[PDB]
């Protein structure tokens, strides 16, 4: 049939994984800051 | 020869193989999205969580 291939919707996955990457980095930046402050 | 009046009017027609129902598969609701999207949705879900 004409089922939507992954190529058709492949930017929502990069964004998703990219946001997860950014999210972890932001969390670790907060952690590192407070950890050094201690 | 001298034919009589036609006792059967006919012509050239078109014959095709008789079709039928397409018996939609049990799991035919996942067609709108390819198999890889479905597999990669589970992966993305397990990763976001």
Curated annotation (Swiss-Prot), chain B:
The postsynaptic actions of L-glutamate are mediated by a variety of receptors that are named according to their selective agonists. This receptor binds AMPA (quisqualate) > L-glutamate > kainate. Ionotropic glutamate receptor that functions as a ligand-gated cation channel, gated by L-glutamate and glutamatergic agonists such as alpha-amino-3-hydroxy-5-methyl-4-isoxazolepropionic acid (AMPA), quisqualic acid, and kainic acid. L-glutamate acts as an excitatory neurotransmitter at many synapses in the central nervous system and plays an important role in fast excitatory synaptic transmission. Detected in cerebellum. The M4 transmembrane segment mediates tetramerization and is required for cell surface expression. The chain crosses the membrane at residues 35-49. This is Glutamate receptor 4. Homotetramer or heterotetramer of pore-forming glutamate receptor subunits. Tetramers may be formed by the dimerization of dimers. Interacts with EPB41L1 via its C-terminus. Isoform 3 interacts with PICK1. Found in a complex with GRIA1, GRIA2, GRIA3, CNIH2, CNIH3, CACNG2, CACNG3, CACNG4, CACNG5, CACNG7 and CACNG8. Interacts with CACNG5 and PRKCG. Found in a complex with GRIA1, GRIA2, GRIA3, DLG4, CACNG8 and CNIH2. The chain holds residues 511 to 559 of 902 of the full protein. It is found in: Cell membrane; Postsynaptic cell membrane; Cell projection, Dendrite. Belongs to the glutamate-gated ion channel (TC 1.A.10.1) family. GRIA4 subfamily. Palmitoylated. Depalmitoylated upon L-glutamate stimulation.
